[PDB]
Amino acid sequence: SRLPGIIFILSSPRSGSTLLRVMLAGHSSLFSPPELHLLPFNTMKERQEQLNLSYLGEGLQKTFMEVKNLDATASQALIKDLESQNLSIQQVYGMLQENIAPRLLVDKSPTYAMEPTILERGEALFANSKYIYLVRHPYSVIESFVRMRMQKLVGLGEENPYRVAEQVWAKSNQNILNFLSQLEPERQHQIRYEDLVKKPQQVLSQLCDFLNVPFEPELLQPYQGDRMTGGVHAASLSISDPNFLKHNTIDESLADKWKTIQLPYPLKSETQRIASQLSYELP
Ligand SMILES: Nc1ncnc2c1ncn2[C@@H]1O[C@H](COP(=O)(O)O)[C@@H](OP(=O)(O)O)[C@H]1O
Ligand SMILES: [Cl-]
Ligand SMILES: [Cl-]
Ligand SMILES: [Cl-]
Ligand SMILES: [Cl-]
Ligand SMILES: [Cl-]
Ligand SMILES: [Cl-]
Ligand SMILES: [Cl-]
Ligand SMILES: [Cl-]
Ligand SMILES: [Cl-]
Ligand SMILES: [Zn+2]
Ligand SMILES: [Zn+2]
Ligand SMILES: [Zn+2]
Ligand SMILES: [Zn+2]
Ligand SMILES: [Zn+2]
Numbered sequence: 001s002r003l004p005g006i007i008f009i010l011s012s013p014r015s016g017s018t019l020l021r022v023m024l025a026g027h028s029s030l031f032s033p034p035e036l037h038l039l040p041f042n043t044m045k046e047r048q049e050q051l052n053l054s055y056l057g058e059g060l061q062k063t064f065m066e067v068k069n070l071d072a073t074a075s076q077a078l079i080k081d082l083e084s085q086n087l088s089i090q091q092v093y094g095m096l097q098e099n100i101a102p103r104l105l106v107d108k109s110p111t112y113a114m115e116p117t118i119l120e121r122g123e124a125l126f127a128n129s130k131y132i133y134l135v136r137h138p139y140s141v142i143e144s145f146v147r148m149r150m151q152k153l154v155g156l157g158e159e160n161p162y163r164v165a166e167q168v169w170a171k172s173n174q175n176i177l178n179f180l181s182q183l184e185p186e187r188q189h190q191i192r193y194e195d196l197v198k199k200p201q202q203v204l205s206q207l208c209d210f211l212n213v214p215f216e217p218e219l220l221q222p223y224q225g226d227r228m229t230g231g232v233h234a235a236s237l238s239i240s241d242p243n244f245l246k247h248n249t250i251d252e253s254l255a256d257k258w259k260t261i262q263l264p265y266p267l268k269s270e271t272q273r274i275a276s277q278l279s280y281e282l283p
Pocket of ligand 12: 056058072232235
């Protein structure tokens with residue numbers, strides 16, 4: 001039997017997903033943690049055995065700390081107990097839902113879009129979830145991915161970094177497009193990164209209407225309060241650094257970077273078609 005629906009943020013890497021999840025973390029109706037790394041796995045033992053991350057990836061540990069007012073050691077002890085009994089991932093999600101209730105979980109990870117079977121698992125575990133599809137211009141994503149030296153994470157450190165980055169953007173976006181094409185229009189909402197940082201009030205107000213929550217001022221203040229970004233920096237990171245703490249406001253200047261970014265190669269024809277579908281211009 002499926003769990004009550006949650007909210008997913010789906011995106012390519014480097015699309016401002018962390019910024020968005022942190023904005024939403026401020027809303028009293030929502031609970032929006034660093035990556036939980038639950039969705040890709042069937043059981044907690046599978047997760048423990050297979051979950052290897054460049055940084056500490058303590059989203060789940062931090063979640064139990066917040067919702068149960070626990071120190072790090074006690075939260076870890078709880079997670080180890082779930083692993084020892086080998087709870088299903090659905091059982092752990094159910095436990096999270098009860099511990100955050102009446103708040104709704106916001107589940108964000110750019111890695112979900114890399115595997116169509118992971119996207120499908122969301123629909124298998126949950127009923128009537130809502131999907132926020134966050135998109136960013138391919139030039140901006142590619143420049144960032146290459147700058148951050150993420151090519152190794154794909155298992156393609158021997159190929160051209162720019163082409164590897166392009167493939168990540170193209171595959172993630174095509175996978176999301178394919179997945180969402182099968183779902184009710186009423187359960188999906190697109191956000192463009194460029195709009196998010198240039199017009200956050202308008203974007204967030206429209207998102208609030210989609211989520212059926214009222215607007216709260218905290219949405220516009222991602223650097224205020226406890227939004228699970230504090231303490232040891234490496235603890236909220238998983239696959240790379242979103243560079244959220246290298247800024248101190250919603251920084252609009254990062255939107256238009258695509259207007260001047262010079263990539264070594266024109267995007268492949270297939271990538272250009274995806275960009276066209278998403279209404280991005282390619283200078
Ligand atoms: N406060 C802020 N304002 C605007 N954009 C931000 C931001 N913090 C992070 N970002 C953008 O989000 C990107 C990371 O996205 P994600 O969280 O999906 O990995 C960053 O990549 P760069 O710092 O490499 O430019 C940056 O462009
Ligand atoms: Cl990323
Ligand atoms: Cl991320
Ligand atoms: Cl994940
Ligand atoms: Cl994972
Ligand atoms: Cl730590
Ligand atoms: Cl990141
Ligand atoms: Cl940072
Ligand atoms: Cl950060
Ligand atoms: Cl800034
Ligand atoms: Zn993960
Ligand atoms: Zn720690
Ligand atoms: Zn990221
Ligand atoms: Zn950082
Ligand atoms: Zn800045």
